[PDB]
Every structure is written in C-alpha cells, then in structure tokens.
Amino acid sequence: SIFRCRQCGQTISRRDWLLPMGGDHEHVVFNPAGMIFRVWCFSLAQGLRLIGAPSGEFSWFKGYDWTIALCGQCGSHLGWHYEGGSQPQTFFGLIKDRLAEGPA
Numbered sequence: 001s002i003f004r005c006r007q008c009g010q011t012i013s014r015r016d017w018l019l020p021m022g023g024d025h026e027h028v029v030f031n032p033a034g035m036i037f038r039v040w041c042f043s044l045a046q047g048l049r050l051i052g053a054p055s056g057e058f059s060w061f062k063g064y065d066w067t068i069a070l071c072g073q074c075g076s077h078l079g080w081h082y083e084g085g086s087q088p089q090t091f092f093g094l095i096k097d098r099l100a101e102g103p104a
C-alpha cells in the first residue's frame with residue numbers, strides 16, 4: 001500500500017514507512033495562519049521537492065527545523081521535511097488529506 005499525491009499521482013511514500021513520533025504517527029496541529037493539518041509522520045518519502053532553508057520557527061516537533069515539502073511533480077504543498085533533531089535526526093510530516101492511498 002502506497003501513498004501518491006492526490007493532485008497528480010506522483011509516488012510519495014508507503015504505509016510501511018509510517019513513523020510513530022512521540023507515540024503516534026498522526027498529529028493534529030495548527031500553523032500561525034490558523035490552518036489545521038492532520039500530519040502523518042513518515043521515516044522516508046520520495047518524489048517531493050524541499051524548498052528553502054530550514055527554520056525552527058513555530059516547529060510542531062521539539063528539536064526539529066522544517067523545510068516545506070512540495071510534490072515534485074505538481075507543486076502541491078504536501079507537508080514538511082524535519083531535520084536537525086535527534087532520534088531520528090530527520091523525518092517527513094505529510095498532510096494526510098493531500099495523499100491518496102492505493103495498491104503498490
């Protein structure tokens with residue numbers, strides 16, 4: 001079972017790659033613009049384009065800096081890559097409702 005970009009079908013991640021950060025792969029969070037995201041943490045993802053330099057500002061995950069992750073194919077905002085932390089150093093937080101799940 002794999003996750004594709006809902007807008008264009010780009011291959012992004014797999015159910016096998018889910019990561020229970022702080023005990024749960026799912027985290028419901030809001031940014032400073034008041035947008036709610038249901039974020040699923042993954043150890044790995046592909047097919048993204050990470051934009052800009054990392055920032056710790058308003059990070060939802062203690063110890064991690066984030067970079068915006070777009071679908072590399074269509075440019076849809078799919079979530080964030082997190083880095084600079086520990087155990088693990090890096091991971092992806094993807095917006096669940098921007099993905100489509102289906103057969104490998």
Ligand SMILES: CC(C)=CC(=O)N[C@H]1CC(=O)NC1=O
Binds near residue numbers: 057058060066080
């Ligand atoms: C431009 C956007 C859409 C930024 C954003 O929402 N950043 C998240 C990432 C994070 O961990 N905390 C935030 O506020």
Ligand SMILES: [Zn+2]
Binds near residue numbers: 072
């Ligand atoms: Zn896409």
